[PDB]
């Protein structure tokens, strides 16, 4: 089994050198889109009953 | 030989060292300003009646007007949710599946279980009676679910933990995904269908790459097996639920988890996760015959949905968002709003 | 044309909904059975008696259907897979009494502890058979292994008072089959709870009465089952 | 007059609980889908005929012996002398037909899912329905229960008094029809399913005794006793004012008669007490 160790090894160095982003703009990436698509949804918003089809 | 396995574990602490430095801060701190989302309360609007036995799987058409599902006497029936009256009702050769799939077309059924088989039936054949169209083999084990890739090449996960994608026409396996452990219970499909995700049984969701064939990064929040898993619809970022009764946040450029979603009143196992169209509501089941409603970027209650007599086996919200249908095991699929 | 559109459908419901009422009667009618055990049980030679990644047998005694499962799941400690046979009429279980020393007979009480307590498998009874009993006969018969050394607790039992020794037989194998059999039985009455019983049998592999056997189990079951739902048992 | 004030309050309890129980019941099973059993439609028939009962008969009754005066016409006696005899006909083959479902239940289980199917039950129920009916306004709306003693004709002239009498041929049939027949069915089927459960019982015991009948014995003494003490005497008294004069009084009539009207309000007390009607019960007006 020392041929399944040497890929393993192998597949940590290659995920190993990955960049990578600060919390905050990971935050602020999804704060933006859910404040601007909040208003193009029936569940978070009722809406009338004239365009509910399923009533 | 043991050597270059310490290599190995001086390069994972490396991984651990550079996660930590990107921790600048949590969520929580930076969303608090926000107004909570208030009340809501959902009313069932339609209730679907004919199956025999329990339900394990459905999905929601493109349309957003056809849905499968999938039940233990061994029939898929599609659905109309609209008029809440049945279009076809597919006999199994073998009575227990645990998933089906909606072909993006509407033109293809997929459906697996105890049998190591994938069946494909064709719904438009030009006589007008479903058949089965091709059977996929090569599996070791249970299949745990499956999603259509496109038309032609499908994406199936398996009990021998591993993970591989198929050729309709042909039959034979194109990439095989390896390197799991425990078994693997979901999957879940990109909007852009580039990459993918997978909850092994063994508390780590790993973000698979569908061209290459090889692994990218390796979540290892839980402490228990996952059973369920999701994308926010923006694709950055996906959602997994456990049986230790927590929802968990995770990032894939940030590379670790932001958030969990649980309660000291709580401490049932959680069956299936879906998301909104905007990806402020997390949806879940539970074991407690009913549901929850979480909110994303808060971590609070919104709702609950009660109503089923036995526990959740499946959930899913329609494409343009304008209703979530639940199954249960009490043979009974329900539409709510 | 929308008024004429709701037609088509009308019309496609009925003939489906005729034939679901149609294959509700046959899906009621039958009785689904799980057959489960160690590597080494013996449920290959059984189910040969019964036919004179997945394996069904369906059979039919005295006008009733039955329907017999056979999951291999082999290698498999963790199973994931079963709760989707909660609904079944009863569990066979299949242990081979002779393997003793060869532990595996800890392991096999290990696996029945596991699923007798299991919480999705709450309300299901189980068939007991302890198969071999002719190879357990000759090994205690002028014999170098000895129960006690595997099995400690041996030394201080007894022969109960209530037991049926089939004739021709020593009291040593009959003294050696009970105790085996209380070992089982001890891990079934720590937690019934009134809800499911276990019923164990003697076989081999010559023996062709076990079908009625089953038979009986099952209908002793559903009778026990109506008695308690109607606050009698 | 002190007697009679007394009278009434007893009386108006007696018709609340008849309507309260019956009419949650039926709302119970109404409005949750769990309840929807082939076993639950004997029930909610003898919950509607209990409750058409303890709603149309006993206030009439009730008014007319407080007033001591009939105060509608013959028509309206005959009516209420028929309904009265149509429900309490039919909410005894009700019982029986419970009776013989629990035995067909226990006493063979492999053949339970066939015997009984949703359809089956629905014409059972108008059988026990129409054959309770032909006894209840056949005779009544025509005239054969009528007797021709003297003392009979005076009472039937006037329009001030409603009082039964009745010959001997009506006395017997509608008796044997309502009471005395669906008796020893219930006491066959009632002896089958004890010995049943003794059976199991002892072969619990022998099986596993070593390592660990009353619950029965109560449950069913529990169900004929009610029956039995509530409608026993008053069928034996029919038979028994008929058979010979100047026996028994009007009183002791009425009392039995009246009697026999309690049984309504304790068959959801006896048919109900399932975990599932404790959770629907705890769920809604709770
Ligand atoms: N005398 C006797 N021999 C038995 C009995 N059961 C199995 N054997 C013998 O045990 C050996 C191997 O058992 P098999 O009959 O092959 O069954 P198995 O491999 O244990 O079956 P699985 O449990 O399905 O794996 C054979 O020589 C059988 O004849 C039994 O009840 N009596
Ligand atoms: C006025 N009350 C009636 C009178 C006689 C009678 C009753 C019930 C069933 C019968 O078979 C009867 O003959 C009583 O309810």
Same mark, same amino acid.
């Given at each position: 089994?020392?041929?399944?160790?040497?890929?393993?090894?192998?597949?940590?160095?290659?995920?190993?050198?990955?960049?990578?982003?600060?919390?905050?703009?990971?935050?602020?990436?999804?704060?933006?889109?859910?404040?601007?698509?909040?208003?193009?949804?029936?569940?978070?918003?009722?809406?009338?009953?004239?365009?509910?089809?399923?009533? | 030989?043991?050597?270059?396995?310490?290599?190995?574990?001086?390069?994972?602490?490396?991984?651990?060292?550079?996660?930590?430095?990107?921790?600048?801060?949590?969520?929580?701190?930076?969303?608090?300003?926000?107004?909570?989302?208030?009340?809501?309360?959902?009313?069932?609007?339609?209730?679907?009646?004919?199956?025999?036995?329990?339900?394990?799987?459905?999905?929601?058409?493109?349309?957003?007007?056809?849905?499968?599902?999938?039940?233990?006497?061994?029939?898929?029936?599609?659905?109309?949710?609209?008029?809440?009256?049945?279009?076809?009702?597919?006999?199994?050769?073998?009575?227990?599946?645990?998933?089906?799939?909606?072909?993006?077309?509407?033109?293809?059924?997929?459906?697996?279980?105890?049998?190591?088989?994938?069946?494909?039936?064709?719904?438009?054949?030009?006589?007008?009676?479903?058949?089965?169209?091709?059977?996929?083999?090569?599996?070791?084990?249970?299949?745990?679910?499956?999603?259509?890739?496109?038309?032609?090449?499908?994406?199936?996960?398996?009990?021998?933990?591993?993970?591989?994608?198929?050729?309709?026409?042909?039959?034979?396996?194109?990439?095989?995904?390896?390197?799991?452990?425990?078994?693997?219970?979901?999957?879940?499909?990109?909007?852009?269908?580039?990459?993918?995700?997978?909850?092994?049984?063994?508390?780590?969701?790993?973000?698979?790459?569908?061209?290459?064939?090889?692994?990218?990064?390796?979540?290892?929040?839980?402490?228990?097996?996952?059973?369920?898993?999701?994308?926010?619809?923006?694709?950055?970022?996906?959602?997994?639920?456990?049986?230790?009764?927590?929802?968990?946040?995770?990032?894939?450029?940030?590379?670790?988890?932001?958030?969990?979603?649980?309660?000291?009143?709580?401490?049932?196992?959680?069956?299936?996760?879906?998301?909104?169209?905007?990806?402020?509501?997390?949806?879940?089941?539970?074991?407690?015959?009913?549901?929850?409603?979480?909110?994303?970027?808060?971590?609070?209650?919104?709702?609950?949905?009660?109503?089923?007599?036995?526990?959740?086996?499946?959930?899913?919200?329609?494409?343009?968002?304008?209703?979530?249908?639940?199954?249960?095991?009490?043979?009974?699929?329900?539409?709510?709003? | 044309?929308?008024?004429?559109?709701?037609?088509?459908?009308?019309?496609?419901?009925?003939?489906?909904?005729?034939?679901?009422?149609?294959?509700?009667?046959?899906?009621?009618?039958?009785?689904?059975?799980?057959?489960?055990?160690?590597?080494?049980?013996?449920?290959?030679?059984?189910?040969?008696?019964?036919?004179?990644?997945?394996?069904?047998?369906?059979?039919?005694?005295?006008?009733?259907?039955?329907?017999?499962?056979?999951?291999?799941?082999?290698?498999?400690?963790?199973?994931?897979?079963?709760?989707?046979?909660?609904?079944?009429?009863?569990?066979?279980?299949?242990?081979?009494?002779?393997?003793?020393?060869?532990?595996?007979?800890?392991?096999?009480?290990?696996?029945?502890?596991?699923?007798?307590?299991?919480?999705?498998?709450?309300?299901?009874?189980?068939?007991?058979?302890?198969?071999?009993?002719?190879?357990?006969?000759?090994?205690?018969?002028?014999?170098?292994?000895?129960?006690?050394?595997?099995?400690?607790?041996?030394?201080?039992?007894?022969?109960?008072?209530?037991?049926?020794?089939?004739?021709?037989?020593?009291?040593?194998?009959?003294?050696?089959?009970?105790?085996?059999?209380?070992?089982?039985?001890?891990?079934?009455?720590?937690?019934?709870?009134?809800?499911?019983?276990?019923?164990?049998?003697?076989?081999?592999?010559?023996?062709?009465?076990?079908?009625?056997?089953?038979?009986?189990?099952?209908?002793?079951?559903?009778?026990?089952?109506?008695?308690?739902?109607?606050?009698?048992? | 007059?002190?007697?009679?004030?007394?009278?009434?309050?007893?009386?108006?309890?007696?018709?609340?609980?008849?309507?309260?129980?019956?009419?949650?019941?039926?709302?119970?099973?109404?409005?949750?889908?769990?309840?929807?059993?082939?076993?639950?439609?004997?029930?909610?028939?003898?919950?509607?005929?209990?409750?058409?009962?303890?709603?149309?008969?006993?206030?009439?009754?009730?008014?007319?012996?407080?007033?001591?005066?009939?105060?509608?016409?013959?028509?309206?006696?005959?009516?209420?002398?028929?309904?009265?005899?149509?429900?309490?006909?039919?909410?005894?083959?009700?019982?029986?037909?419970?009776?013989?479902?629990?035995?067909?239940?226990?006493?063979?289980?492999?053949?339970?899912?066939?015997?009984?199917?949703?359809?089956?039950?629905? @014409?059972? /129920? +108008?059988?026990? !329905? =129409?054959?309770?009916?032909?006894?209840? *306004?056949? %005779?009544?709306?025509?005239?054969?229960?009528?007797?021709?003693?003297?003392?009979?004709?005076?009472?039937?002239?006037?329009?001030?008094?409603?009082?039964?009498?009745?010959?001997?041929?009506?006395?017997?049939?509608?008796?044997?029809?309502?009471?005395?027949?669906?008796?020893?069915?219930?006491?066959?089927?009632?002896?089958?399913?004890?010995?049943?459960?003794?059976?199991?019982?002892?072969?619990?015991?022998?099986?596993?005794?070593?390592?660990?009948?009353?619950?029965?014995?109560?449950?069913?003494?529990?169900?004929?006793?009610?029956?039995?003490?509530?409608?026993?005497?008053?069928?034996?008294?029919?038979?028994?004012?008929?058979?010979?004069?100047?026996?028994?009084?009007?009183? @002791?009539? /009425? +009392?039995?008669? !009246? =009697?026999?009207?309690?049984?309504?309000? *304790?068959? %959801?007390?006896?048919?109900?007490?399932?975990?599932?009607?404790?959770?629907?019960?705890?769920?809604?007006?709770?």
């Amino acid at each position: 089994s020392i041929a399944q160790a040497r890929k393993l090894v192998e597949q940590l160095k290659m995920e190993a050198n990955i960049d990578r982003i600060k919390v905050s703009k990971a935050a602020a990436d999804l704060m933006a889109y859910c404040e601007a698509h909040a208003k193009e949804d029936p569940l978070l918003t009722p809406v009338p009953a004239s365009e509910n089809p399923f009533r | 030989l043991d050597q270059l396995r310490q290599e190995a574990e001086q390069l994972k602490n490396q991984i651990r060292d550079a996660r930590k430095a990107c921790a600048d801060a949590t969520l929580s701190q930076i969303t608090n300003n926000i107004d909570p989302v208030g009340r809501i309360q959902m009313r069932t609007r339609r209730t679907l009646r004919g199956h025999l036995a329990k339900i394990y799987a459905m999905h929601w058409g493109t349309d957003s007007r056809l849905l499968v599902s999938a039940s233990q006497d061994g029939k898929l029936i599609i659905w109309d949710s609209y008029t809440t009256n049945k279009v076809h009702a597919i006999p199994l050769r073998s009575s227990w599946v645990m998933t089906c799939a909606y072909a993006p077309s509407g033109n293809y059924v997929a459906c697996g279980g105890l049998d190591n088989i994938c069946s494909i039936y064709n719904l438009k054949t030009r006589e007008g009676n479903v058949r089965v169209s091709r059977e996929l083999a090569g599996h070791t084990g249970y299949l745990s679910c499956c999603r259509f890739l496109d038309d032609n090449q499908i994406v199936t996960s398996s009990g021998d933990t591993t993970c591989a994608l198929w050729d309709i026409e042909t039959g034979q396996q194109t990439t095989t995904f390896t390197g799991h452990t425990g078994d693997v219970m979901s999957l879940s499909l990109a909007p852009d269908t580039r990459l993918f995700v997978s909850g092994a049984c063994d508390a780590s969701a790993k973000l698979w790459d569908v061209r290459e064939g090889m692994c990218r990064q390796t979540f290892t929040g839980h402490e228990s097996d996952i059973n369920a898993i999701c994308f926010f619809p923006n694709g950055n970022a996906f959602a997994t639920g456990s049986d230790d009764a927590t929802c968990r946040l995770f990032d894939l450029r940030a590379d670790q988890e932001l958030m969990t979603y649980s309660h000291d009143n709580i401490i049932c196992g959680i069956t299936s996760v879906s998301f909104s169209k905007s990806g402020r509501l997390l949806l879940a089941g539970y074991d407690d015959f009913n549901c929850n409603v979480w909110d994303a970027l808060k971590a609070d209650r919104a709702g609950v949905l009660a109503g089923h007599d036995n526990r959740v086996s499946c959930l899913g919200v329609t494409d343009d968002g304008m209703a979530v249908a639940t199954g249960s095991w009490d043979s009974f699929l329900k539409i709510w709003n | 044309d929308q008024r004429n559109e709701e037609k088509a459908q009308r019309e496609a419901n009925k003939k489906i909904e005729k034939q679901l009422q149609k294959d509700k009667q046959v899906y009621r009618a039958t009785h689904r059975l799980l057959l489960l055990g160690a590597g080494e049980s013996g449920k290959s030679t059984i189910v040969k008696q019964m036919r004179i990644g997945i394996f069904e047998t369906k059979f039919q005694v005295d006008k009733v259907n039955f329907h017999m499962f056979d999951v291999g799941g082999q290698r498999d400690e963790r199973r994931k897979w079963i709760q989707c046979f909660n609904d079944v009429t009863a569990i066979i279980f299949v242990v081979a009494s002779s393997s003793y020393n060869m532990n595996r007979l800890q392991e096999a009480l290990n696996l029945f502890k596991s699923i007798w307590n299991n919480r999705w498998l709450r309300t299901i009874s189980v068939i007991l058979f302890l198969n071999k009993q002719d190879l357990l006969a000759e090994k205690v018969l002028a014999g170098k292994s000895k129960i006690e050394d595997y099995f400690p607790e041996f030394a201080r039992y007894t022969t109960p008072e209530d037991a049926t020794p089939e004739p021709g037989e020593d009291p040593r194998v009959t003294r050696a089959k009970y105790f085996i059999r209380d070992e089982f039985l001890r891990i079934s009455t720590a937690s019934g709870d009134g809800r499911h019983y276990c019923y164990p049998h003697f076989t081999c592999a010559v023996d062709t009465e076990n079908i009625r056997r089953v038979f009986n189990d099952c209908r002793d079951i559903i009778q026990r089952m109506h008695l308690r739902q109607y606050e009698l048992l | 007059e002190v007697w009679v004030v007394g009278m009434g309050i007893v009386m108006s309890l007696i018709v609340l609980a008849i309507v309260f129980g019956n009419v949650l019941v039926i709302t119970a099973i109404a409005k949750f889908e769990r309840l929807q059993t082939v076993t639950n439609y004997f029930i909610t028939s003898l919950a509607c005929a209990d409750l058409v009962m303890g709603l149309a008969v006993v206030p009439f009754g009730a008014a007319h012996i407080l007033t001591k005066t009939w105060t509608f016409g013959n028509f309206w006696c005959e009516f209420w002398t028929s309904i009265d005899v149509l429900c309490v006909t039919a909410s005894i083959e009700t019982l029986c037909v419970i009776a013989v479902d629990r035995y067909f239940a226990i006493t063979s289980p492999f053949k339970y899912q066939s015997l009984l199917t949703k359809n089956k039950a629905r @014409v059972i /129920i +108008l059988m026990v !329905w =129409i054959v309770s009916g032909l006894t209840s *306004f056949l %005779p009544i709306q025509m005239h054969w229960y009528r007797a021709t003693h003297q003392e009979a004709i005076n009472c039937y002239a006037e329009e001030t008094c409603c009082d039964f009498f009745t010959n001997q041929a009506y006395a017997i049939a509608s008796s044997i029809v309502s009471f005395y027949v669906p008796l020893v069915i219930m006491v066959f089927v009632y002896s089958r399913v004890f010995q049943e459960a003794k059976r199991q019982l002892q072969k619990i015991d022998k099986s596993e005794g070593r390592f660990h009948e009353h619950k029965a014995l109560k449950t069913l003494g529990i169900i004929m006793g009610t029956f039995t003490l509530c409608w026993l005497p008053f069928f034996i008294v029919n038979i028994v004012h008929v058979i010979q004069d100047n026996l028994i009084r009007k009183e @002791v009539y /009425i +009392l039995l008669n !009246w =009697i026999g009207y309690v049984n309504s309000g *304790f068959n %959801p007390l006896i048919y109900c007490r399932s975990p599932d009607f404790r959770i629907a019960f705890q769920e809604l007006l709770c």
